[PDB]
């Protein structure tokens, strides 16, 4: 299968105030198709003046948007939902080109669940209420949940348009304008989202999109004095940088969704076909590039051998290939530099004495040699001090760890600075709830993995995050509380 | 002269291992109140391990068992109100007429409020489909740290520790080095009430040391800070660069008081007085920009002068004293620099503007109650928080103008309006960019009412039901009862 050269797209511009506009930075970058190594597009990088221009546009649009009725805002966000449903397949193809994730994932998950969250928040806008508190017959307090104003979202590359929707949906539903910076690795679908919002009737300026580099555009947003909140999804290290600068510049509210090393606990009474199916879904979806992945799989010592056989069987079914083929369920990694990092982790697994159950190398041959492919990889005989066990790899690398008793596995599951997700496989009522209640993670799955309903707040304990996304609480967290006391009695001064 | 004050770790006073001490002064006399030990890095580690142990005991108790213990501490605080207030007056220089009526009363009010809410702390349940549902738990963060300020030492210790403890956490509290004494008393009271050892530890020290060790510690899950913007930026950075902690910040402001054209000017003047000269002007929420209509400005100025002439500086333990020295001479030096800038920038000095002098005043950092008028928005005294007894009066002409000018600041803590008009009151308040808004009053902060800043004045809130919840972390749990589908 040849004659498959794809030409590059038109140069991608910034989106400010309901239109595409040239950056004033004079700088551009390129986004690559990780399946081919070909340039997808040249993209303009927002400079400091561009960020200033976006903030003033956002301030102007926010005023229009917040003065509307609640239901007028709901109807506009619902119209964007309708367009996203209609354009699901077109957007999924673009996301696949930009990220390397199989169309079988992007057409089923990325836009579907992004729009699910926007649809959820659209319906909740009229239910955003303050409080009233009587103090005495002559005085009472009431509160308003006011927009923060202009907020910024900084996206990650593994779920580009989904992250854009999960950040912008509650921000807009709460009456804010959002300036969104997509990952420089994956800028394309965020620009499509901006056009869709405008087409749905969103006032100009309420969702502006500034592609750029993290050290530049991202920093300018975290530093801007008129941005009230930053929401960041990305790596633990970059999170530390964003959180510091948002403080050291102007005191902003913050949300951070970072990575993890999430444990999957297989109990002694688990069905091992179910356990293996869960472990597969917790490690090899999106080629292992998922923050919540269950990359430390704890198996009772007495079941380890049988569990390894069941994992080997299922790994052998994984279908790498043409990302637009229906039956493909595994893609290359997002970039060649990322593959180099994943390969360094795999080599450290080998050199530290873990047993390679399968994989451990790049894929080779016609069609794979030009993509950033890593074979699905499983290490076993792992110990808690190994680098591959302690550190997030963000590739298709499962670590299997044996354990003897429940107290032990809880200790070892929690013995980490991460705390994003966790799960248990057990048919037993008491074991399921008892174990989960003791795990130090924000997102816990019993006898499943990976579902993230719009209703369910998600985020990390410890170094895996600050704040939450989704759920009613995240609509509220994009407002700020104003307390107002009405004193109807005579005011007494002591002077 | 009090005994040398020790650290409070795990239900007892313990010697610090830093080898370091500092002194706290009586700001009215210059006398040394106490030598105080400073917590070192190992002391902070020890306090954290103590807090981890106590937090486990505390969180395993029933909700009502926790509620009863905090209520016992309230009862003790009510009984010791006057003794604690007198110590607070000695440490801060604030009149006993304030500390015995406000500081402990309202600190204990908030503890009492949260004690009763512990059993109402609930998660959620969300059905997805017949075969699957989600439930959430509001779990303790674990060990949290509070960093207090010197203007309301025990009140701040109570407003931070009450929701933290009620949410099932242990708190390590670092008082201001200027005012460490009542926080140590509070730790003893909590133990006397039955608080498990380790759940409230108190570490006096310096900001450059003890405070930094707390923000850096990997096993502290949240920092709550009250103080100045400068220290706040420093605390915010270290908490991020260390272990990604949740953060709350209660900072200063330059809050506007808007007097409307239909306001009674005796009421307006009384509100402006209370918004500027309580605690000798050392209050973050003070209404230090007083906007008055041009046509009423002269009459308002006269009414302010009449009330300023009533202020009673003197013996801080006398019933009728209602004005104290500033907390320190270095702080007075800064306030005096602001007063000088008002003079040199062309504001009109209506009254005050100098130190108080004479027997009884020369040994304290007293500043006369000071009022500038004819002020403009570009003046330093208008632009910056002074944190002393300095009111700035600003003329305005129309409502749209005064809203713009009130909001034209990066601060955003408080605001207020004086008007008998229904539409004017709500219409103006809804447009102001401040978290704490008072109509026809100033300064009341009910336990039920969330308080904190917009913009550069803060992150997060204190008090209200929401602050109990903000000292928990949400865990979402999905129960999948249907058959799990893998695509592999
Ligand atoms: Cl262990
Ligand atoms: Cl103006
Ligand atoms: Na790309
Ligand atoms: Na003192």
What would your notes on this structure say?
2 copies of one chain form a homodimer. By secondary structure, chain A is an alpha/beta fold. Chain A has 2 domains: 14-259 and 456-481, Aldehyde Dehydrogenase, Chain A, domain 1 (3-Layer(aba) Sandwich); 262-446, Aldehyde Dehydrogenase, Chain A, domain 2, CATH 3.40.309. Helix content of chain A is 38%, strand content 19%. Chain A has 15 helices and 20 strands. Chain A has helices at residues 48-67, 70-86, 88-99, 103-124, 160-173, 188-200, 214-223, 236-249, 272-281, 304-315, 336-351, 387-390, 406-414, 429-438, 472-477, and strands spanning 14-15, 20-21, 28-32, 39-44, 132-136, 139-147, 150-154, 177-181, 207-209, 229-233, 253-257, 263-266, 296-300, 355-358, 377-380, 397-403, 421-425, 443-446, 465-466, 479-487. In chain A, the strands form 5 sheets. In chain A, strands 14-15-16-13-12-17-18 form a 7-stranded mixed beta sheet, with helices on both faces. In chain A, a hairpin with a 6-residue loop joins strand 3 and strand 4 (39-44). In chain A, helix 2 (70-86) packs antiparallel against helix 4. The longest helix of chain A has 22 residues, at 103-124. The termini of chain A are far apart. Chains A and B meet through strand 6, helix 8, strand 11, helix 9 and helix 14 of A and strand 6, helix 8, strand 11, helix 9 and helix 14 of B. One sodium ion binds next to strand 3 of chain B.
């Amino acid at each position: 299968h040849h004659h498959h050269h794809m030409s590059r797209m038109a140069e991608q511009q910034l989106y400010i105030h309901g239109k595409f506009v040239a950056a004033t930075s004079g700088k551009t970058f390129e986004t690559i198709n990780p399946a081919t190594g070909e340039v997808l597009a040249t993209v303009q990088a927002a400079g400091r003046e561009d960020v200033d221009r976006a903030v003033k546009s956002a301030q102007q649009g926010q005023k229009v948007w917040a003065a509307m009725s609640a239901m007028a805002r709901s109807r506009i966000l619902r119209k964007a939902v309708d367009i996203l449903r209609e354009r699901n397949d077109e957007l999924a193809r673009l996301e696949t080109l930009d990220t390397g994730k199989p169309l079988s994932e992007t057409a089923a998950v990325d836009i579907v669940t992004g729009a699910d969250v926007l649809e959820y928040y659209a319906g909740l806008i009229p239910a955003l209420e303050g409080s009233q508190i009587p103090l005495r017959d002559s005085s009472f307090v009431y509160t308003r949940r006011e927009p923060l104003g202009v907020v910024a979202g900084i996206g990650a590359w593994n779920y580009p348009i989904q992250i854009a929707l999960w950040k912008s949906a509650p921000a807009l539903a709460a009456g804010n304008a959002m300036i969104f910076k997509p990952s420089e690795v994956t800028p394309l679908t965020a620009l499509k989202l901006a056009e869709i919002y405008r087409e749905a009737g969103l006032p100009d300026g309420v969702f502006n999109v500034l592609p750029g580099i993290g050290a530049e555009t991202g920093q300018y947003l975290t530093e801007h004095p008129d941005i009230a909140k930053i929401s960041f999804t990305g790596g633990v290290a970059s999170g530390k940088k964003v959180m510091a600068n948002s403080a050291a510049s102007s005191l902003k509210e913050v949300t951070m969704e970072l990575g993890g090393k999430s444990p999957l606990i297989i109990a002694e009474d688990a069905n091992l076909d179910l356990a293996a199916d869960i472990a597969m879904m917790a490690n090899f979806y999106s080629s292992g590039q998922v923050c919540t992945n269950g990359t430390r799989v704890f198996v009772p010592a007495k079941f380890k051998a049988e569990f390894e056989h069941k994992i080997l069987e299922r790994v052998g079914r994984i279908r790498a290939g043409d990302l637009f083929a229906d039956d493909t369920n595994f893609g290359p990694l997002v970039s060649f530099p990322h593959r180099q990092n994943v390969l360094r982790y795999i080599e450290s697994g080998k050199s530290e004495g873990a047993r390679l159950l399968c994989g451990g190398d790049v894929l080779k041959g016609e069609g794979f040699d030009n993509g950033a492919w890593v074979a699905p990889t499983v290490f076993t005989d792992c110990t808690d001090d190994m680098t591959i066990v302690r550190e997030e790899i963000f590739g298709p690398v499962m670590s299997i760890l044996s354990y003897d008793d429940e107290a032990e596995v809880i200790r070892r599951a929690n013995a980490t600075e991460y705390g994003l997700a966790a799960g248990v496989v057990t048919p037993d009522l008491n074991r399921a709830h008892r174990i989960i209640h003791q795990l130090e993670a924000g997102i816990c799955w019993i006898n499943s993995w990976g579902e993230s309903p719009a209703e369910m707040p998600v985020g990390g304990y410890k170094h895996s995050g600050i704040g939450r996304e989704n759920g009613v609480m995240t609509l509220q967290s994009y407002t700020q509380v104003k307390s107002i006391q009405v004193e109807m009695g005579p005011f007494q001064s002591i002077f």
